[PDB]
Coordinates of C-alpha atoms in Angstrom, one line a residue:
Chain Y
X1 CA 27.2 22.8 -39.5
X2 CA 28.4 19.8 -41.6
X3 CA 31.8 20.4 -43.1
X4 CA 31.2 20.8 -46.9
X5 CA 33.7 20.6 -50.0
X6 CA 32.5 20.6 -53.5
X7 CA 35.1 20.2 -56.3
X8 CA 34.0 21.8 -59.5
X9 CA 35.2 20.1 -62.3
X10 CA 34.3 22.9 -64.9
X11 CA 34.8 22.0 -68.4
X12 CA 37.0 19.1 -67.4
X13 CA 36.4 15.3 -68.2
X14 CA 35.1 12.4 -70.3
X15 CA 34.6 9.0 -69.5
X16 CA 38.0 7.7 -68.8
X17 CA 38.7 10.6 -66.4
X18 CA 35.9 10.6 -65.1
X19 CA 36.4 7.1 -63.8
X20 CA 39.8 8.0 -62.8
X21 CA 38.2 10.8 -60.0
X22 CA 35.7 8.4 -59.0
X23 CA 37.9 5.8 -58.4
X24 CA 40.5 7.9 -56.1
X25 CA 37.4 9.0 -54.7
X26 CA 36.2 5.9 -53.5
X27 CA 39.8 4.6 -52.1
X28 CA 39.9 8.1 -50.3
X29 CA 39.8 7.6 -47.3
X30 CA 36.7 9.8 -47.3
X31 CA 36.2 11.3 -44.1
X32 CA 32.8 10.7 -43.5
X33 CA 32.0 14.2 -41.6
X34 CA 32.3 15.7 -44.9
X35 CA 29.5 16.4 -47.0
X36 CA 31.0 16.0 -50.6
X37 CA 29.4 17.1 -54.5
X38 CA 31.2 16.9 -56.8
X39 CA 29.9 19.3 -60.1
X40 CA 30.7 17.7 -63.8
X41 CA 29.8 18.9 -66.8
X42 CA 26.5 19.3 -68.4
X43 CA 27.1 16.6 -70.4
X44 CA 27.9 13.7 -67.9
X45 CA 25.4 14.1 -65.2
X46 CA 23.5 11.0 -66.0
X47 CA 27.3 9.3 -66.5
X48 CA 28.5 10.4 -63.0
X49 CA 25.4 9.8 -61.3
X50 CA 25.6 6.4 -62.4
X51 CA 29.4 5.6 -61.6
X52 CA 29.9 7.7 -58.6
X53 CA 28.9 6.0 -55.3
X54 CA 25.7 7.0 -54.0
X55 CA 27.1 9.0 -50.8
X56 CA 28.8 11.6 -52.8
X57 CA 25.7 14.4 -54.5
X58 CA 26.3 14.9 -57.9
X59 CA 25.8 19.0 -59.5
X60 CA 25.0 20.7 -62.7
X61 CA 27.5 23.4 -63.5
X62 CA 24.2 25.6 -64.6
X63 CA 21.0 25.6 -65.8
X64 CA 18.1 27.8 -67.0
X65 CA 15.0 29.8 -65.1
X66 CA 12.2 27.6 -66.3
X67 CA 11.0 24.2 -67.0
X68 CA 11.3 23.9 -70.4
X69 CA 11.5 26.2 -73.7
X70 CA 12.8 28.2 -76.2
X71 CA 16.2 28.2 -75.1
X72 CA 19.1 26.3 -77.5
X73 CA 21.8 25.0 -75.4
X74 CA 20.4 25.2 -71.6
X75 CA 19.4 22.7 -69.5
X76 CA 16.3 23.4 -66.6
X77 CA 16.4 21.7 -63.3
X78 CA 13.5 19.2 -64.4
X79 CA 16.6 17.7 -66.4
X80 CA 19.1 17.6 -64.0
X81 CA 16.5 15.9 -61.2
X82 CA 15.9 13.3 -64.4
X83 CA 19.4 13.1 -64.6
X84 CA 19.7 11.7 -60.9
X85 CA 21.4 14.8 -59.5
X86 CA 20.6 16.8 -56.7
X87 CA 23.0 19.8 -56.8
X88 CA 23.4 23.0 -59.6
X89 CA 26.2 25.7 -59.2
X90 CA 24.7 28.7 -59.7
X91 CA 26.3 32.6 -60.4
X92 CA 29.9 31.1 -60.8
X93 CA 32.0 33.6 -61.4
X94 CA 32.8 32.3 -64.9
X95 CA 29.3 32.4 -65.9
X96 CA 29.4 36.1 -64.4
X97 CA 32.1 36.8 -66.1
X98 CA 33.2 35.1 -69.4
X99 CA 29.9 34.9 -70.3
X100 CA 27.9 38.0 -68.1
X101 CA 25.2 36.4 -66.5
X102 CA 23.9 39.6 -64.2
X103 CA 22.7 39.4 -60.5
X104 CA 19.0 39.6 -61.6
X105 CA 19.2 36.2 -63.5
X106 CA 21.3 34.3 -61.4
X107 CA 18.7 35.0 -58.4
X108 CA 15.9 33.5 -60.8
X109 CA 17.9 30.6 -61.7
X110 CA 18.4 30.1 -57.8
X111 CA 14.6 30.4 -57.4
X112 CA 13.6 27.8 -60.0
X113 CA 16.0 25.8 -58.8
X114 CA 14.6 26.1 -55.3
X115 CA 11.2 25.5 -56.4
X116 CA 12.2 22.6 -58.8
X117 CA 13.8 20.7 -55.8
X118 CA 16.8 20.9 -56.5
X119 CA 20.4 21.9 -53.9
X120 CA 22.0 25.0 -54.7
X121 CA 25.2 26.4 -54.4
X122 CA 25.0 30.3 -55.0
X123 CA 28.4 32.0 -55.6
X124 CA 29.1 35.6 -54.9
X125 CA 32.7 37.1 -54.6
X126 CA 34.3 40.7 -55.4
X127 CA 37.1 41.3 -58.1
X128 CA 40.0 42.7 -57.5
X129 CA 39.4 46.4 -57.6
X130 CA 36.6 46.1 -55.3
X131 CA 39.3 44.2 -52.8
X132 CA 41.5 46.9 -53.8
X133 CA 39.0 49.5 -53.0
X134 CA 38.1 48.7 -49.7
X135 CA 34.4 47.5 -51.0
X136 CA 34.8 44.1 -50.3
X137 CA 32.1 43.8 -48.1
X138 CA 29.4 45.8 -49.6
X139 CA 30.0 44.2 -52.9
X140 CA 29.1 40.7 -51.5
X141 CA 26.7 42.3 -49.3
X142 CA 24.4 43.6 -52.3
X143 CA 25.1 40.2 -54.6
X144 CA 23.2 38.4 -51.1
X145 CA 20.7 40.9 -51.4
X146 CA 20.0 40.6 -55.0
X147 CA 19.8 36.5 -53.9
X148 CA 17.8 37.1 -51.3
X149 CA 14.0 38.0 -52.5
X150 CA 14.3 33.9 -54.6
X151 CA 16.0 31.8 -51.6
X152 CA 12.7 30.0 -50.9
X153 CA 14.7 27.3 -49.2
X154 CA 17.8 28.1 -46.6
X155 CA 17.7 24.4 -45.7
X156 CA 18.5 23.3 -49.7
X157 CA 21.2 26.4 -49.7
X158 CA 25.0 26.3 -49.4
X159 CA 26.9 29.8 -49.9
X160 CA 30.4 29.9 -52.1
X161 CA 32.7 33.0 -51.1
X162 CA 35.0 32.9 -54.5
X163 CA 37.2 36.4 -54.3
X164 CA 37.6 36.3 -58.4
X165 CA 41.2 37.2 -58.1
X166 CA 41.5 34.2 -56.0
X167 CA 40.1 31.8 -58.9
X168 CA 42.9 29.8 -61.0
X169 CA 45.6 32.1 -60.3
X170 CA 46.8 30.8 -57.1
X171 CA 46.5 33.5 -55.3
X172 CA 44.4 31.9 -52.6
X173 CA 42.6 34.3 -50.0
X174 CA 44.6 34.3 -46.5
X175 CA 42.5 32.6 -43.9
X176 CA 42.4 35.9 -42.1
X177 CA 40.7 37.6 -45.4
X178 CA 38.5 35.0 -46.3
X179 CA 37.3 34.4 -42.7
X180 CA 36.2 37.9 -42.4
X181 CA 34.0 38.0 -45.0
X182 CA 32.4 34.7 -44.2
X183 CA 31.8 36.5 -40.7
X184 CA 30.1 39.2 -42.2
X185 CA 28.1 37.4 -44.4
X186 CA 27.0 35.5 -41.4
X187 CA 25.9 38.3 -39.8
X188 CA 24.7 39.7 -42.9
X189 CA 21.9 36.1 -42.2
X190 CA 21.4 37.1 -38.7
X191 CA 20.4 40.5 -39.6
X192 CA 18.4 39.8 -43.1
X193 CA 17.0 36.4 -42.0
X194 CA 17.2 35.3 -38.7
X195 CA 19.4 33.7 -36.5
X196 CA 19.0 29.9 -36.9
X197 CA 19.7 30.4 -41.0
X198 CA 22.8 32.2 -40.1
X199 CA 23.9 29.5 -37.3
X200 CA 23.0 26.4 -39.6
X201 CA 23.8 27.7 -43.4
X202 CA 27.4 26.5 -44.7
X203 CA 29.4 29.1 -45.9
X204 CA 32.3 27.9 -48.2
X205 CA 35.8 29.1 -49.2
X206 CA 36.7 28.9 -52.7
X207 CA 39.9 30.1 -55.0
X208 CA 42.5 28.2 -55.6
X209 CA 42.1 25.8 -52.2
X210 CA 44.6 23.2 -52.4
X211 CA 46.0 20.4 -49.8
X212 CA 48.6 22.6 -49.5
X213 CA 46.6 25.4 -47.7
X214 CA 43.0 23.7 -46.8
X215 CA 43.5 23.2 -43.2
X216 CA 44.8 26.4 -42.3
X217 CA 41.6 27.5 -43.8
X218 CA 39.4 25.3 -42.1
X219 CA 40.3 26.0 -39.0
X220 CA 38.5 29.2 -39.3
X221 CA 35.3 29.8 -37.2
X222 CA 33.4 30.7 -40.1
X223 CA 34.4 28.8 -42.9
X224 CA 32.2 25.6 -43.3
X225 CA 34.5 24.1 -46.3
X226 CA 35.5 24.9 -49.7
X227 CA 34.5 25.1 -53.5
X228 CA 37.5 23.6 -55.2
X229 CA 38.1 23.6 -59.1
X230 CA 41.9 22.8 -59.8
X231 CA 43.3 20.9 -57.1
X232 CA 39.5 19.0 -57.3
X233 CA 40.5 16.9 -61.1
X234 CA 43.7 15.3 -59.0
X235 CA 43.8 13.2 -55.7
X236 CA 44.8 15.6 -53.5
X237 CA 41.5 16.6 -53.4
X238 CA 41.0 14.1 -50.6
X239 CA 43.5 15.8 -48.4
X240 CA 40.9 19.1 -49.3
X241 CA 37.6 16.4 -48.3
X242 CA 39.8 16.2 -45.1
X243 CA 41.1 19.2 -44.1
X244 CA 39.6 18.9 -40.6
Chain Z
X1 CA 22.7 17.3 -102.6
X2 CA 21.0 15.4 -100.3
X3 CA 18.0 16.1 -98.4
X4 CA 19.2 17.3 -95.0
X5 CA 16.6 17.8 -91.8
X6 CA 17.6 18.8 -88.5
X7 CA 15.0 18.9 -85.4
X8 CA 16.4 20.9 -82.6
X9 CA 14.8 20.3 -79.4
X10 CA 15.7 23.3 -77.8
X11 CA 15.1 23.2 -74.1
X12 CA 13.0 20.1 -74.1
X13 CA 12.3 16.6 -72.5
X14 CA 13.2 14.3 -70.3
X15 CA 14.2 10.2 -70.3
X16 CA 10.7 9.4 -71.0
X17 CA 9.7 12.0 -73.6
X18 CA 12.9 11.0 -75.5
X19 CA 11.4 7.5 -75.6
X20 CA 8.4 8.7 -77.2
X21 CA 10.1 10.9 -80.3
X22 CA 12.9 8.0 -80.9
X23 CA 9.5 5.7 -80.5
X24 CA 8.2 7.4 -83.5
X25 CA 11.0 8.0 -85.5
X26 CA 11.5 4.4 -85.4
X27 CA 8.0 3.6 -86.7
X28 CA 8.6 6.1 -89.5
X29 CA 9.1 5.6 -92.4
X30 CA 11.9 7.3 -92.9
X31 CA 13.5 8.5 -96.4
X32 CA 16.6 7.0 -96.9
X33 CA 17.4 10.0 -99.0
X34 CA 17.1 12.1 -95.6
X35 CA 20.2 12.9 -93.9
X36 CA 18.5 13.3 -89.9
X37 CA 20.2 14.7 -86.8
X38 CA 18.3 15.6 -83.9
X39 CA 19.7 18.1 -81.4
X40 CA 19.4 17.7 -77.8
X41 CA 19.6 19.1 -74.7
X42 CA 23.2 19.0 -73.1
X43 CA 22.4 16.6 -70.5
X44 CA 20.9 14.0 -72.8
X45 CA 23.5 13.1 -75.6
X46 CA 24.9 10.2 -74.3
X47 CA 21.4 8.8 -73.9
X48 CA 19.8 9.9 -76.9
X49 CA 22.7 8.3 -78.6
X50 CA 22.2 5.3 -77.0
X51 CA 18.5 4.4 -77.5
X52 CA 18.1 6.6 -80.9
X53 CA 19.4 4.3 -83.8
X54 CA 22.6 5.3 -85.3
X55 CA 21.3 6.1 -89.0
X56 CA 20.1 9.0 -86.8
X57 CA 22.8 11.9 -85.9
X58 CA 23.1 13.0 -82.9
X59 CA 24.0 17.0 -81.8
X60 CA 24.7 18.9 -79.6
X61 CA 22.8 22.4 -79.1
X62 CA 25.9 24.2 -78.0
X63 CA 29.9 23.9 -77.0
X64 CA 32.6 26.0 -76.3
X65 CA 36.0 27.0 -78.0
X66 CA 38.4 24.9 -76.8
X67 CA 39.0 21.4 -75.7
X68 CA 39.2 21.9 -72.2
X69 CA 39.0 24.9 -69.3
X70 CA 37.9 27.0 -66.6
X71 CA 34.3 27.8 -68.3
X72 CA 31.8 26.3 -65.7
X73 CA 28.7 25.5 -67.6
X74 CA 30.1 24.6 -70.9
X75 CA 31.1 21.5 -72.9
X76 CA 33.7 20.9 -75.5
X77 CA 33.6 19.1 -79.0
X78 CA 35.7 16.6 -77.3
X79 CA 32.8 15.9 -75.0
X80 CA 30.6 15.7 -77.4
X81 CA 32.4 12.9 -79.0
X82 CA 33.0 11.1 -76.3
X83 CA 29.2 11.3 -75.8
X84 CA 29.0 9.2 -79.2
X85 CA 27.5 12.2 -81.2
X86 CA 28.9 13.8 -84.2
X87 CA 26.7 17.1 -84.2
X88 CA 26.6 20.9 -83.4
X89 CA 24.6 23.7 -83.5
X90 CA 26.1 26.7 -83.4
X91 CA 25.3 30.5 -83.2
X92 CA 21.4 29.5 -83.4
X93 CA 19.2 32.5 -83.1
X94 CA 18.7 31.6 -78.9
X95 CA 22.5 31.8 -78.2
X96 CA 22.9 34.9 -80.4
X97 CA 19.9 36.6 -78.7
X98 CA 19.1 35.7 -75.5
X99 CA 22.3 35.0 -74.5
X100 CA 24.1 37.6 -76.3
X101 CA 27.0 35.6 -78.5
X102 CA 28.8 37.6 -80.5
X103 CA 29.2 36.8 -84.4
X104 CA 33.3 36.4 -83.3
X105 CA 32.4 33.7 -80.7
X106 CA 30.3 31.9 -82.7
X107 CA 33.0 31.9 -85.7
X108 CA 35.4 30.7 -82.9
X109 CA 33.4 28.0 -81.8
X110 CA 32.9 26.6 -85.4
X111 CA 36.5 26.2 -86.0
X112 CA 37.0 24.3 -82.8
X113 CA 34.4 22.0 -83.4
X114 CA 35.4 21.7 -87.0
X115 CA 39.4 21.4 -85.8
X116 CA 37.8 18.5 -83.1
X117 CA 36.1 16.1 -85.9
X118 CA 32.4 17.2 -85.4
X119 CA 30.2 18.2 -88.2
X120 CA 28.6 21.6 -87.6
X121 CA 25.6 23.5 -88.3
X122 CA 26.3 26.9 -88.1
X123 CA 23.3 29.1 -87.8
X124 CA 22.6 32.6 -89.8
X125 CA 19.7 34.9 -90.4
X126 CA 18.0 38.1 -90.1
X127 CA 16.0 40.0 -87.7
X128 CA 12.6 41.0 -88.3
X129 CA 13.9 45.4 -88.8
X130 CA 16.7 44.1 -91.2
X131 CA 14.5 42.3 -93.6
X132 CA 11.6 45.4 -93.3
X133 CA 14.7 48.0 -94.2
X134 CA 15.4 45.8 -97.0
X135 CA 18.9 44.5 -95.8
X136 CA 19.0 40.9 -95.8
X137 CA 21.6 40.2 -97.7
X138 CA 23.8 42.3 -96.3
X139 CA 23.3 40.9 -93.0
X140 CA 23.1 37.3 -94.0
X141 CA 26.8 38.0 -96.2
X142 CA 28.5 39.7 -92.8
X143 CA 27.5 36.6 -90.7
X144 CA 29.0 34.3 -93.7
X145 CA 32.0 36.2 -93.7
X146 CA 32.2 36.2 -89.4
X147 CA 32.6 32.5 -90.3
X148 CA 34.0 31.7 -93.4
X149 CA 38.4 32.6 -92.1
X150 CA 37.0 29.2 -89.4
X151 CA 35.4 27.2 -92.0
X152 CA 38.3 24.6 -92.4
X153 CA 36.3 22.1 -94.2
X154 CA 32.9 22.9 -96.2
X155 CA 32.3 18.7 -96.2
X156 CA 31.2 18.9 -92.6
X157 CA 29.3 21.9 -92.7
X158 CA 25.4 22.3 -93.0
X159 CA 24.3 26.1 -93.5
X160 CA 20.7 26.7 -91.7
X161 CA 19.4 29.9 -92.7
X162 CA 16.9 31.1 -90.0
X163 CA 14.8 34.1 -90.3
X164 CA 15.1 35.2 -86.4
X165 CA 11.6 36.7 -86.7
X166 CA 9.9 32.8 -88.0
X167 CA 11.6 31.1 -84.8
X168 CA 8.6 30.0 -82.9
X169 CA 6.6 32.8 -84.0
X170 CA 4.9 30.4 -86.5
X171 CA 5.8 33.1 -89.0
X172 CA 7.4 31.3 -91.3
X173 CA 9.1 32.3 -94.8
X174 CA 7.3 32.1 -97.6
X175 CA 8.8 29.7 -100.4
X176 CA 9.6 32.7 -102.4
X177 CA 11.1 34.7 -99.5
X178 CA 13.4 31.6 -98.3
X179 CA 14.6 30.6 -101.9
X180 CA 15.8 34.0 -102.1
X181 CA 18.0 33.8 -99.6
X182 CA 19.1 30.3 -99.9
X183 CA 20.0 31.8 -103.9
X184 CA 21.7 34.3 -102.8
X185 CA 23.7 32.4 -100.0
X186 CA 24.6 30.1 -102.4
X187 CA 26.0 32.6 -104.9
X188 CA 27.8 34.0 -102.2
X189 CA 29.6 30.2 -102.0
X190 CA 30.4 31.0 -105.6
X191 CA 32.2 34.2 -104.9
X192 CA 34.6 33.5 -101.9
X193 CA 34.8 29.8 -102.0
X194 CA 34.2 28.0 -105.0
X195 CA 31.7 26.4 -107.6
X196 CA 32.3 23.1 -106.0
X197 CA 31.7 24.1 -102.9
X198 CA 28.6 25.8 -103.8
X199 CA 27.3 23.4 -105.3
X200 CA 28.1 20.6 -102.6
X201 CA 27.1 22.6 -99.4
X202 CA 23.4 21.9 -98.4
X203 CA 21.7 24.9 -96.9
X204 CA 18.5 24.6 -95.0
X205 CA 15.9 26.4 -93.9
X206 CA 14.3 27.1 -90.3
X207 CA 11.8 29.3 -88.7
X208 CA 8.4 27.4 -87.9
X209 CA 8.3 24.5 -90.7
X210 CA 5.7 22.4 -90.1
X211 CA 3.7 19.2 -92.0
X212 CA 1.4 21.5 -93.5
X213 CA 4.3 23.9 -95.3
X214 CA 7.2 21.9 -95.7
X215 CA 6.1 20.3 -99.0
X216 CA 6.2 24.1 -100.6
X217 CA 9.5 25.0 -99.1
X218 CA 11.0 21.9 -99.9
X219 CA 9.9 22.3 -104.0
X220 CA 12.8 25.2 -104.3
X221 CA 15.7 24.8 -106.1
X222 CA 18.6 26.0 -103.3
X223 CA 16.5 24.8 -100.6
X224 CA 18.6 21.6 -99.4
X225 CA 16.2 20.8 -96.0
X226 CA 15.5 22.2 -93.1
X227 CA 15.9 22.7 -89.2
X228 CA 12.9 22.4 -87.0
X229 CA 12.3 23.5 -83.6
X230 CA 8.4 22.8 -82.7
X231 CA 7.6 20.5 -85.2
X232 CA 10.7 18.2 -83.8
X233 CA 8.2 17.5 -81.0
X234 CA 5.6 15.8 -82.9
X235 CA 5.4 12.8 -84.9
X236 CA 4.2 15.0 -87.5
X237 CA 8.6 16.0 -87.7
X238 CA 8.4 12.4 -89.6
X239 CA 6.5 14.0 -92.7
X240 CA 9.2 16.7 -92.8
X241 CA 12.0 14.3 -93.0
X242 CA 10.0 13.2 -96.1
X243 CA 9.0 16.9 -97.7
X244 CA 10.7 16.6 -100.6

């Protein structure tokens, strides 16, 4: 499995820093076993796309569950293929949770993304009283199943573990926790799927990754690479691209 | 007050149907006496801006409340001016209702944009049981007054009253039924701004205006333009832009 480390900028950026990324992004050094997106805002995809070298995918931070219509403010995957990108975030837990997009509509955004072409990064993660409550594991377990029925495409799929308590609060998941639950879920492909999607399907670790912690991480038998918000708008996010 | 007309695109287009609408407002003719924005999708305002000529505004169909953050999928008024566009719609009928933003939220994000240098057009109006039950007004006067502590400057603001049940439904508002509440909105102005303000403040009209019925709406006293959705398609939005 291709090491993997997408660095979601969220609602981060205009032109000047945008340059500013791209251009400690080019110096790097990149390693060049890494596959590397990097997720802008729905504003700049076309911008990015343009200035970004062509080795590094560029992602929509959402979009919508059809082509085109009646919806003020979304954006469909038509767009973002028009826009030169390849890559959406789907389900992150800021749309889940600031702005309550439910299981059921996050799996039919992944499935017309899927069908539109498009590379998807599906995020599921447990908050902190399911941790709490010992029900990590069937909390993630029933966000994969409400994925499940509209992955039309394993091949076009990489998975984002994101614990929510783990997200901006520094309070990164221990490479013990987070590799148990990328075990599980891998299992969880064996069992639902079949075994070759659960050998060859990245599973990646996100909340709060930084240089600091990313190879301690990565080390981990099950953990494929990381989602990376923060640490991603500064340069250290090339020690994170390189944390093998 | 001058003529103001808005087309909101919605979820619509791509690089080459963009082409085609700024091909055909370009051919016009245009009133000079028009103020025009179009609003489009969030991937596209950097390149509408580009290739639409500049006596045409430029908006955005959405943004959130603050300049930057952790809110994957959403852009700021400072991205939309750095996007070269001066425009945004906000709290249209498709964020209130399919996505479920709250009249707060939507006050919110008016006074950010406002705070940010954009020009806004906050969107009000009524559903389809509130008119029936003969409560109108008092719905259209609770959404004014959701906004009006954020309203930090009435110069930049455009009103667009929208009946929710003529969006798309091609069941527009009669000329009677939209004056009425344009009057009344107006009037309100009066009471908890001022007669300067009243009188200044354009407030348009929206729910399915096409060529054929945008010569009678236009004929009103208080009704200052309009915001169109469908018709913005079409080169038939160029006789709209001309209605009055």
């Amino acid at each position: 499995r291709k090491f993997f480390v997408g660095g979601n900028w969220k609602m981060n950026g205009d032109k000047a820093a945008i340059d500013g990324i791209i251009s400690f992004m080019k110096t790097g050094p990149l390693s060049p076993n890494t596959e590397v997106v990097v997720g802008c805002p729905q504003c700049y995809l076309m911008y990015t796309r343009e200035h970004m070298p062509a080795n590094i995918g560029i992602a929509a931070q959402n979009c919508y569950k059809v082509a085109k219509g009646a919806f003020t403010g979304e954006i469909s995957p038509a767009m973002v293929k028009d826009c030169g990108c390849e890559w959406v975030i789907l389900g992150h837990s800021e749309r889940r949770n600031v702005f309550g997009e439910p299981d059921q509509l996050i799996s039919e955004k992944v499935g017309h993304a899927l069908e539109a072409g498009l590379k998807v990064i599906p995020c599921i993660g447990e908050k902190l009283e399911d941790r709490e409550g010992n029900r990590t594991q069937e909390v993630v377990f029933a966000q994969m199943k409400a994925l499940l029925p509209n992955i039309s495409d394993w091949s076009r799929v990489v998975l984002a573990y994101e614990p929510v308590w783990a997200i901006g609060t520094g309070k990164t998941a221990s490479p013990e926790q987070a590799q148990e639950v990328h075990a599980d879920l891998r299992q969880w492909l064996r069992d639902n799927v079949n075994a070759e999607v659960a050998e060859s399907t990245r599973i990646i670790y996100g909340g709060s990754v930084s240089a600091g912690n990313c190879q301690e991480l990565a080390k981990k038998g099950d953990i494929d690479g990381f989602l990376v918000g923060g640490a991603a708008l500064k340069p250290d996010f090339v020690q994170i691209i390189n944390a093998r």
